[PDB]
Design a protein around this nucleic acid. Structure first.
Lengths: 77, 136, 83, 80, 122
RNA sequence: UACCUAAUCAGAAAGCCACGGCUAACUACGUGCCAGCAGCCGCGGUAAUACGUAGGUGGCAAGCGUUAUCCGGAAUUAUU
RNA sequence: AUGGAGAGUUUGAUCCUGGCUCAGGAUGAACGCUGGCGGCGUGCCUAAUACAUGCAAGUCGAGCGAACGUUAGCGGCGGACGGGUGAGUAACACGUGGAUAACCUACCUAUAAGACUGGGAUAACUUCGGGAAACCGUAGCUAAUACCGGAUAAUAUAGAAAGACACUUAUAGAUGGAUCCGCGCUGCAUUAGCUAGUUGGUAAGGUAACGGCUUACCAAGGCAACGAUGCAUAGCCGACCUGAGAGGGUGAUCGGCCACACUGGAACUGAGACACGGUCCAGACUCCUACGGGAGGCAGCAGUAGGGAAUCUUCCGCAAUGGGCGAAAGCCUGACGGAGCAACGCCG
RNA sequence: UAAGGAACUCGGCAAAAUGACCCCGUAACUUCGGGAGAAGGGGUGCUCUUUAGGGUUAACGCCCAGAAGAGCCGCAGUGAA
């Protein structure tokens, strides 16, 4: 009766539109592109702030994967 | 070549033959294999009437009505006692027991069991041999 | 949601409940995070409330309450009046 | 937290700074009672210190970073 | 144009897989037969199990033929191979399922049972 | 509606088995290699209390004979 | 050492090795029945026997649009968990430890956290051509503690939507899995052998991890007796008898785990599956029939059919013990409880 | 030469199938030679790249085709005998 999304939702969270997941994948496609082109998107590492007004304000990515890119960023400055 | 031996002969158990060749039988029809289920008694199909007249330590005309049981099996069965079933082509429980020194028949037949119970002549049993009608 | 669930384990029709820091998603035999000895409600011996929640003091700060509605069972374990 | 003492004898010796080491493990029959033995097989990243057939080596616990080498230590316990 | 010594492929699950025409019922002198005609044949190839065994004389009805029949409106409809269905005595299928399309000329032959099990009817 | 000493109406421990036995167990008839009995014994071609009925007897326990499943039996791939 | 241990069987009696015909208890039992009364328990043991069923479990504004605390239905939320039978892994799968330079640790509640910053808008409401149901058309919309990244803390040394008189980065309180070896695993004589990147080498990645995973290349009769490699196939354990101990057994229980969900196979946004009643694909099945369709738990309960010398009612309740919904309240439950059940042992 | 495929006939008589190269795969039996081309299953045109086979050759010029790809065309590529 109650839609499950806290227990075994491995395939329950993998059964709808992936447009937003694909759109977020295109935004994280410049991970090495901006680093190889020296973009200003990864500039000013005092913020990325990216822990005082980013994660909660507006964020929609992965966990461990993002954490890897959330280590060098938000701390470099 | 190079095919030598290492492991020697161990202490194997003596060869033995299972007794009562009529129990633990179950020929499959979907796999055509003997599906054992540890059954101490099967069914039967009385379709013959024996007449073992000559013998050795009997000095009397005996008999052995070969009755085919379940799992496509045929054994020389025999009805022990005076019970004379008059119902042919009918299931008959195979008495759980073999004969004693009787060349030919090597199995017994349970009295009654969805067939001719028997006669009320005897009344000293009141337990087996299709006994009934308890005298008062 | 993580209270002191009474682990119902032992023989049939007589489970020996043992108050332990368990979750609400794992009832009866689930997962104990902070075991608290065991409660004996046999009412035929002296040692009854033999709960050892010495390491369960950290549990009472972010997720700790009653699972099997045991107020008098937790009444003996008076570890409050200090906050 | 630290390392272990995987001291043993190196029998095989490959190239590209790679070689396997032999350990030792006791074994007894719980049902019977006869005492036997068994040797474990673990490779170790050595250079020239760890030899073979005699030269013993005291390998310590460390990052594997190999297909078989679980520990890496050139510390030799002997030299054939 | 199914005549004598003609091999057809059974289009049902009755056990048979191939039959051989033995005679075309309909009258003395009858040579060939088309869709909606009953014929006597023998099983030449059967599958393990089923109700019909090899070397059996049964009756079947044609449902598909290389040479298609002509309609009264001036239309035609030819198939790719000949096929039939082993029927009973009261025009009843001996199987339980039909495979492939079926001609709409079986509706005039009082074969509702066979025409109500065919996936397609054209 | 446990054990219950209470009203205290009268609501019933029978049984089946060996009985010459082996193995704690029987008398008369009827049988008489006809049938029964029938693990071990065997008892049936005449005096089978071994048979079948009656009076019974030894056992045990609300019952009794039966079928397939470990170990007393006994070391019996030995291992003591 | 609470300290086993009859015969026959062979002359006409015999000793002596040897094997069981045979002086007993046990008998998940049924049984032909003479089965007074009962506390307690097991009961398709014969049966992963086929399939009509009663049938999984409903909800919520402290945060929003009926006529009238949530009443409009969106959003928080077990269908995989209660369960069911155990053919299925001759083996870390379970039984059984430290552990992890094989390690992830999503997660569950407290405090930092100042309700910040880009927002339109969303189901209901409903403009709604038809269709036997077997589905397109005509389409505007309106919400809600539904809800949107960069510059100011975390491996540097390149913060929000709002609670009553909710809250978010950091993390704690807490939390689920992958792993090393030490432990359970048949023999073939009427088979006597098996791995070749078998045996070790490091580099394209990425997941609980090194990585013989592939990465460049690497040996001869080498591996293997440790029968590896073939089979045997079984759900594993905590257990009860047992020689008197020396020997020997080693699972019905009842819970953990490991499974399964017509048959397979490939994929599918929200918090830890292959899903006991979501997908698609195929196969042989289920049945009515508007020519199109629906498909099957009965592997949730109780039944019709199966052959069982050998086994539970298509009965009441959520007392309670539950947990999931859910400011309380509300609200859920063939989970579970109570009655039919047979000498199933009742011993008085 | 439409459907069919020995129903023809004393009898598959006479047609019709098969066929060259290349690659894979090959049974019973046996006097150990054989059976065996057993059976059976694939491939073949033209253009451009590569990097390489004996070379006429320094040469992989050029050419005989060795591989390895990428393309183009027809109903059909030992397109005939």
């Amino acid at each position: 009766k109650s839609a499950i999304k806290r227990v075994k939702t491995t395939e329950k969270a993998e059964a709808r539109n992936i447009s937003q997941k694909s759109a977020m994948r295109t935004a994280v496609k410049n991970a090495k592109t901006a680093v190889s082109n020296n973009a200003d998107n990864k500039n000013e590492l005092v913020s990325l702030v990216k822990l005082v007004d980013k994660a909660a304000q507006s964020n929609l990515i992965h966990s461990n994967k993002a954490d890897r890119i959330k280590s060098q960023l938000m701390t470099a400055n | 070549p190079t095919i030598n031996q290492l492991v020697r002969k161990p202490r194997q158990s003596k060869i033995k033959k299972s007794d009562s060749p009529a129990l633990n039988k179950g020929f499959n029809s979907k796999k055509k294999k003997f599906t054992d289920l540890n059954s101490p008694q099967k069914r039967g199909v009385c379709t013959r009437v024996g007449t073992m007249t000559p013998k050795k330590p009997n000095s009397a005309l005996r008999k052995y009505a070969r009755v085919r049981l379940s799992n496509n099996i045929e054994i020389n069965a025999y009805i022990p006692g005076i019970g004379h079933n008059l119902q042919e082509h009918s299931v008959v429980l195979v008495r759980g027991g073999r004969v004693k020194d009787l060349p030919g028949v090597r199995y017994h037949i349970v009295r009654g069991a969805l067939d001719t119970s028997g006669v009320d002549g005897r009344r000293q049993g009141r337990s087996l041999y299709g006994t009934k009608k308890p005298k008062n | 949601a993580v209270k002191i669930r009474l682990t119902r384990l032992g023989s049939k029709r007589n489970p020996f409940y043992r108050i332990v820091v368990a979750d609400a998603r794992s009832p009866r035999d689930g997962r104990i995070i902070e075991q608290i000895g065991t409660y004996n409600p046999t009412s035929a011996n002296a040692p009854e409330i033999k709960v050892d929640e010495a390491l369960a003091l950290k549990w009472l700060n972010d997720g700790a309450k009653p699972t099997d509605t045991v107020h008098n069972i937790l009444s003996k374990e008076g570890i409050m009046k200090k906050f | 937290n630290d390392r272990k003492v995987y001291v043993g004898k190196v029998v095989s010796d490959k190239m590209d700074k790679t070689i396997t080491v032999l350990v030792e493990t006791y074994k007894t029959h719980k049902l019977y009672g006869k005492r036997v033995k068994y040797s474990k097989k673990y490779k170790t990243h050595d250079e020239n210190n760890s030899a073979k057939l005699g030269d013993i080596v005291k390998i310590q616990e460390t990052r594997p970073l190999s297909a078989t080498k679980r520990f890496r230590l050139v510390e030799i316990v002997e030299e054939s | 144009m199914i005549q004598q010594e003609t091999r057809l492929k059974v289009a049902d699950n009755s056990g048979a897989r191939e039959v051989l025409t033995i005679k075309v019922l309909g009258g003395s002198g009858r040579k060939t037969a088309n869709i909606g005609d009953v014929i006597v044949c023998t099983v030449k190839n059967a599958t393990p199990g089923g109700v019909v065994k090899k070397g059996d004389v049964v009756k079947a009805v044609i449902v598909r033929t290389k040479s298609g029949v002509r309609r009264n409106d001036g239309s035609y409809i030819k198939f790719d191979e000949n096929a039939c269905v082993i029927i009973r005595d009261d025009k009843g299928p001996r199987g339980t399922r039909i495979f492939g399309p079926v001609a709409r000329e079986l509706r005039e032959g009082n074969f509702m049972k066979i025409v109500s099990l065919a996936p397609e009817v054209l």
